[PDB]
Amino acid sequence: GSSGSSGQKGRVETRRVVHIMDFQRGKNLRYQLLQLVEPFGVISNHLILNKINEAFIEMATTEDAQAAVDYYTTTPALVFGKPVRVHLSQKYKRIKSGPSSG
């Protein structure tokens, strides 16, 4: 509906981290969250929170992270057949795993 273009979204070239929220859990959860950004570019790193339904996935480029969120802000993102939220993090930087089990 309505005319094309007629405006532009606010964007920044700082950071490369896709924030994902509101997900259902299961044995393939790491994979399900990666598949929201795997077709969009090169995965650099990932982090899945235990205490709350939050996850952070760092792309090798800002354009790779921006392309995933530009699609998933309008298109419904899903995990385990249930809806989720997909945005860029203004907090997160270079992701790194904890020692042993982490």
Side-chain angles (χ1 to χ4, degrees), residues 33-45:
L33 292 166
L34 281 164
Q35 287 300 323
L36 297 171
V37 318
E38 278 276 11
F40 289 100
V42 187
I43 315 298
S44 220
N45 288 300

Side-chain angles (χ1 to χ4, degrees), residues 1 4 9 16 20-21 27 33 47 50 61 71 78 84 93 98 100:
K9 178 179 179 296
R16 323 184 295 200
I20 311 159
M21 294 171 279
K27 62 178 183 292
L33 292 166
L47 165 64
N50 297 93
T61 97
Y71 177 94
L78 304 180
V84 313
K93 299 187 295 182
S100 183

Side-chain angles (χ1 to χ4, degrees), residues 3-100:
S3 298
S5 184
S6 301
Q8 296 185 357
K9 178 179 179 296
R11 289 171 62 193
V12 301
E13 297 183 353
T14 200
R15 295 170 160 93
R16 323 184 295 200
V17 194
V18 186
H19 190 191
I20 311 159
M21 294 171 279
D22 293 331
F23 49 82
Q24 294 298 339
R25 303 208 181 227
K27 62 178 183 292
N28 296 333
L29 174 62
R30 177 184 65 83
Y31 165 95
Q32 294 270 320
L33 292 166
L34 281 164
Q35 287 300 323
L36 297 171
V37 318
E38 278 276 11
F40 289 100
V42 187
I43 315 298
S44 220
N45 288 300
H46 64 275
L47 165 64
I48 325 298
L49 285 288
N50 297 93
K51 184 59 172 66
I52 62 285
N53 297 338
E54 292 185 353
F56 297 96
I57 311 188
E58 181 194 354
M59 307 303 288
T61 97
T62 194
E63 297 187 353
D64 288 1
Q66 287 176 52
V69 176
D70 172 63
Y71 177 94
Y72 284 120
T73 195
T74 89
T75 322
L78 304 180
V79 168
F80 292 114
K82 296 296 184 180
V84 313
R85 280 185 172 103
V86 180
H87 304 271
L88 290 179
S89 185
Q90 283 57 253
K91 178 170 63 178
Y92 280 80
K93 299 187 295 182
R94 187 59 171 172
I95 295 178
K96 181 175 179 180
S97 298
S100 183

